[PDB]
DNA sequence: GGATTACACCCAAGACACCAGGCACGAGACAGAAAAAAACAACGAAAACGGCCACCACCCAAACACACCAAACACAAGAGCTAATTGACTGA
């Protein structure tokens, strides 16, 4: 488990889903902090595929897969590649609440 | 009560007479003195250690002066007016 360093997704839990042996970027599952193209011309909430299909805009639909604003790849839950130096791979140590989310 | 008159008494002057203790004179002797050998004590010739005293500091202890300094500066009352962040950096 890691946490991203920059962007709007700073200092939130990201589960390392796949580790790419290219040693440039790795696959991370993360909770989208997005407004679903309604306010921008926020709290971590479960992604809504139907709402992001209804509101329109930049969207590419592959059933459970979605490519949306920011070239964001999500499935079912964002699944996207982020740099190893753009995340902290040592020193997360999660609790049970994030495990439920992901002496 | 010293002096006068009257009265009693005894003891030394005045002789002799036995004899013997002190004086003229002579002799052994011991205190005393000249002299020698040798200390020696109050009369001077000097001092040299306890007794004052001054340099050269300390040594605290204010006196003064200089500057630094922090706090104080009448009540109330009405109104208007302006500002309460703004470049800008950096993922996207």
Curated annotation (Swiss-Prot):
Ubiquitously expressed. Residues 36-103 are annotated as: Interaction with RNA polymerase II. Methylated by PRMT1/HRMT1L2 and PRMT5/SKB1. Methylation negatively regulates interaction with P-TEFb and RNA polymerase II. Phosphorylated by CDK7 and CDK9. Phosphorylation by P-TEFb (CDK9) at Thr residues of the C-terminal repeats alleviates transcriptional pausing and promotes transcription elongation. Dephosphorylated by the INTAC complex when transcripts are unfavorably configured for transcriptional elongation, leading to premature transcription termination: dephosphorylation is mediated by the PPP2CA component of the INTAC complex. Dephosphorylated by the PNUTS-PP1 complex in termination zones downstream of poly(A) sites, thereby promoting deceleration of RNA polymerase II transcription. It is found in: Nucleus. Residues 1-29 form the KOW domain. Component of the DRB sensitivity-inducing factor complex (DSIF complex), which regulates mRNA processing and transcription elongation by RNA polymerase II. DSIF positively regulates mRNA capping by stimulating the mRNA guanylyltransferase activity of RNGTT/CAP1A. DSIF also acts cooperatively with the negative elongation factor complex (NELF complex) to enhance transcriptional pausing at sites proximal to the promoter. Transcriptional pausing may facilitate the assembly of an elongation competent RNA polymerase II complex. Belongs to the SPT5 family. Interacts with SUPT4H1 to form DSIF. DSIF interacts with the positive transcription elongation factor b complex (P-TEFb complex), which is composed of CDK9 and cyclin-T (CCNT1 or CCNT2). DSIF interacts with RNA polymerase II (Pol II); forms DNA and RNA clamps that stabilize Pol II elongation complex while maintaining the nontemplate DNA strand in the transcription bubble and nascent RNA in the exit channel. This interaction is reduced by phosphorylation of the C-terminal domain (CTD) of POLR2A by P-TEFb. This is Transcription elongation factor SPT5. The chain holds residues 278 to 416 of 1087 of the full protein.
């Amino acid at each position: 488990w890691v946490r991203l360093k920059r962007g709007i997704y700073k200092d939130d839990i990201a589960q390392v889903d796949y580790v790419e042996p290219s040693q440039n970027t790795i696959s991370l599952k993360m909770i989208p902090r997005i407004d679903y193209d309604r306010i921008k011309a926020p709290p971590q909430r479960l992604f809504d595929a139907e709402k992001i299909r209804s509101l329109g805009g930049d969207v590419a639909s592959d059933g459970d897969f979605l490519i949306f604003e920011g070239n964001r790849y999500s499935r079912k839950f964002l699944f996207k590649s982020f740099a190893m130096s753009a995340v902290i791979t040592e020193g997360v140590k999660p609790t049970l609440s994030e495990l439920e989310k992901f002496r």
